[PDB]
Amino acid sequence: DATRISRSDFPADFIMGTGSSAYQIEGGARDGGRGPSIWDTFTHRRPDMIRGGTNGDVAVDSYHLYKEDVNILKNLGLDAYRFSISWSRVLPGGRLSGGVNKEGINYYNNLIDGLLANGIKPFVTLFHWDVPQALEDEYGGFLSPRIVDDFCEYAELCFWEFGDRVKHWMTLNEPWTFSVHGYATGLYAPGRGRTGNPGTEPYWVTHHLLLAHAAAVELYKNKFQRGQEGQIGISHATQWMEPWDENSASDVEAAARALDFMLGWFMEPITSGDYPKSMKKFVGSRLPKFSPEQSKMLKGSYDFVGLNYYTASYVTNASNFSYNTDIHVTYETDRNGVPIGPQSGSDWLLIYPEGIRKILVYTKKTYNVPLIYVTENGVDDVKNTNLTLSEARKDSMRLKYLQDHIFNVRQAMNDGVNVKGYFAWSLLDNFEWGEGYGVRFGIIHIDYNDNFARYPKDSAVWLMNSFHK
Template identity: 60%
Template sequence: MCMSKTSGKYQSYSNSLERQSVIETPGRTMISNGSEVQRSLLARNASRKVTRRDFSEDFVFGTATSAYQHEGAAAAGGRGLSIWDTFTLKTPGKVKDNSNANVSVDTYHRYEEDVKLMKKIGLDAYKFSISWSRVLPGGRLSAGVNKEGIKYYNNLIDTLLAHGIEPYVTLFHWDLPQALEDEYGGFLCPQIIKDFCEFVSLCFWEFGDRVKNWITLNDPWTFCFGGYVMGSFAPGRGSSSAEHVKGSIACHRGTKSHACNGNPGTEPYLVAHNLLLAHAAAVDLYKQTFQQHQEGKIGITLFSKWFEPLHDNELDEEAATRAFDFMLGWFLEPLSSGDYPRSMRKLVGSRLPSFSKEESKLLKGSFDFLGLNYYTATYVKSASNSPDVEVSYTTDPRVTYTSEEVPIGPKAASDWLYIYPQGIYKLLVYVKEVYKVPFIYITENGVDEINDTNHTISEARVDDIRIKYHQDHLLCIRNAIKAGVNVKGYFIWSLFDSFEWNEGYTVRFGIFHVNFKDGHLARFPKFSALWLMNFLSSKLAKGRTKRQIEDSEEHNPVKRLKTG
């Protein structure tokens, strides 16, 4: 860790981490270089196992999915189109294998058997999202409520609870109704705030008597970056979207100084602004109208990588601070202080929207808990923009990301995912130190492998890399808890292999292998599912191997967990 005298957020955190590293290494001589202390600590921890007993009894273990990626049944039960339906239909080349999620894992029809699998593994919770266009096909109440959609989620929630599994429900996981995108540009327009509140109010009313943990937004950063900077996610706007962004969006409320024409230097900031205001309005609605008698909690889930300075110098440390500000701080700073990070105000200037006093007040502290999605990390170094550089969210931070040039860890299947378990520890401590967040869930953590279509089912079930990934990350979470971070839960992404956005079906994240070739979507537990069951269960004998568990007649998870 760098030892310069930078006064920024990263250096403040760095000093804190160095103190903790020394405290956690009793009997060692004080080492002047903090990074050496960390390496020693991590090497010692690598030889130690983590068990369920390392976490409190009320610590929640679950898995996570999302509606568009997993439900399938795109044309069933009165569901309306979402922007992902349109995106995969009209621009199939944006998805690697030209696929879509029209069927995917079909949890819509198979939720009962899927919940039984969760129960057999021993999960405490299941994080899923509600498809806005399945309950409100036209996007708002005046266009009609789809009773079939309401019935489906009621049945899912009731089935989960009947099996002792707590539902954690996300209200928006990127699948905006196409009707609202067509009408006024969706989250580019402030009108979305009113319509979002109608949608969430319906959800609170219909499901809030049983759902006690609500998440307003899942990872708004990826929605903004993929959908409005890179054009690789729905609705496909941004730097690579010229072929299908036709003219300006017809929103005339609150955007008069910013053209909505696919500009990656303006649109992502407008969308993030409206996402934040929609979140704050939804939380206020819940707290004012529903929370007292429903006795639930409401929060938000944010994504962040860990950013490590490439060199031990002040410039790269400051670059790391800016990288955090433009990813995590873009959303967490307004939720903590009521405004965007100072570095964003300085570098983005007039392109960054402003909050009114009333909006800032509504935003500040608008979460009962924070969800963090962590997968990966990267080295960063300082960059300077030339006068002719394109004005864009990607160039505004003045940061160079060096994941390919200098990888921070082993590469997984996806181009963006490098394995660095230490990052989850560092990120948790950073959030606690910088933002004073009192209560955190890890709402997504996982690793993918290439979908090798030549593998047999038996070969595809062997995923030792996934077992090690989760073991190492849980060990680091345990250490963060020991360092004073209040982490209360861990959700694995994902329960099943599924449609992975612009990666399509070319990668697999699930702890269950799904056979997409047999026409039945049969589920097979990977070794990671067996490991998780063993981890969570006190009934299995200590020290038994995967193969011993698998071959046992008394405890045969393959026979017990296989479906289809």
């Protein structure tokens, strides 16, 4: 019975928490010296790409309301909190010569300090998609190898300013999503590929993302880790991939190829220093090569890996060039009119709790990761502006979703997966990228009509009751 899952089913030192990213919650987009990110620009110049034409100028105003969020996190009672630093908040021009923003540094110090004063461990992501527009404009951001050294300078600033208090770092969050939705489908910032080339740019972007991650890891391990004694890893997008027909060799290979193109793309480089065999074969000359020094730097470049999980799909074989077609699979939601899971508030999120278990087991089996966190797992409310607060806060479906997924994490730990922590996504309803504000992922409700007033959902209350202390 999943409804009974609690902290006493986990080791005493198992880490529970919640999450956010800077662009999605902070606001103060031009306050306290922040420079623009590619997401400010995308939402400003291309509001048609956003459901409701909205943007993160104000988001849910966590920049000004940080003390209120810390009070929420204290009452919630979980050990940890995962957030990202906005690169163009601390470095408005992305590179050092664009200026060092002291006030932006003070904001993160205030947040870290409030978190530690309340017994909450900060888990901090350097890059959650908000590339400085200055670097995007000067040289194409992640399209250019120039991004590697600038990300390193930025990482080093953060390690220096915060590393005495921050002990868990992640270089990147979902570089998969960043690369694919930014450069293959062109639906997320910087909006390319839909002037862009979905057949070449996602592979260059991912290549530079990997090299940025490698160089920041090397920087931390060689220059900060002995003095600061923290850990550094990375968070990856995952989706469970199931063969459509369990007895079809062709579907078994296709589901594995889908895993290769989503997770393997990033996991194999940090495991053996090269891309998956299947990507080499299907992408060919369009997949960049790592130099021997790059391979050596990438291999084993983490102290832990976080996985982000939402949903699952059946997979079968497919029937000029583009990342989406290179995978050579067709996704399927149903077997004989039975969907793999029911929909959440979003039609792409089919609830399949076993998938987080299979994705954990798969990651240990294939990549032999010694330390794994679930860095994101969560579900969105059905869209409804007709509900009063007593009704909107009864998130039965999210409560069941978390219970079921956390139960599956425990199952994966019984299978031998060394999971060290689990972070629900998200702490607050927030800006859901291309979907804007209508998609609510929070365990804490936001009232968009009244200065983003916070109110806990039943899921938050159950997390506190079941997992506090």
